[PDB]
Design a protein around this nucleic acid. Structure first.
Length: 148
RNA sequence: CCACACCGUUCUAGGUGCUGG
């Protein structure tokens, strides 16, 4: 029940959480594409991630991965180079080119959406929802403290 | 509402499907 309201608010903003293991791998594949400073269109980044993710996770799609990318878009993780007529190119901002930096920004964004939706979720519940364990308790509390 | 897909959102944001369930 505590999942349902959170994931509905996440999806209402064009975002998605695919699950602890799947979201982690998805974000690490974004790093594989963008850690070296490559400027990829949204289409190409999504095509890059989906290909590498669907062997481990068959349900991965252009649509569901696009929703993960949007979460990082909303969290301001990209340098966006707009172009006339054509589609924009996206690079990872230099400060989010490691997993823990990107993941902090990603997690913070989900917590912001939860706060904007009027939901109250404790750090232990957050650790379960985002990591499938209770070993990220202080990590989530730290994120909540900075948002408040 | 869900899925799929397209266009847009870094001036921050969602839209469109005369796609499917």
């Amino acid at each position: 029940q505590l999942s349902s309201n959170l994931w509905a608010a996440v999806r209402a903003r064009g975002c998605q959480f695919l699950g602890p293991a799947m979201q982690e791998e998805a974000l690490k594949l974004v790093l594989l594409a963008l850690e070296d400073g490559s400027a990829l269109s949204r289409k190409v980044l999504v095509l890059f991630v989906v290909q590498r993710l669907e062997p481990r996770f068959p349900q991965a799609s252009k649509t569901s991965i696009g929703h993960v990318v949007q979460l990082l878009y909303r969290a301001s993780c990209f340098k966006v180079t707009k172009r006339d007529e054509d589609s924009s190119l996206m690079q990872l901002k230099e400060e989010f080119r490691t997993y823990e930096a990107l993941r902090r920004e990603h997690d913070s964004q989900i917590v912001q959406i939860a706060m904007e939706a009027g939901l109250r979720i404790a750090p232990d519940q957050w650790s379960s929802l985002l990591y499938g364990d209770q070993s990220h308790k202080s990590h989530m509390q730290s994120i909540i403290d900075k948002l408040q």
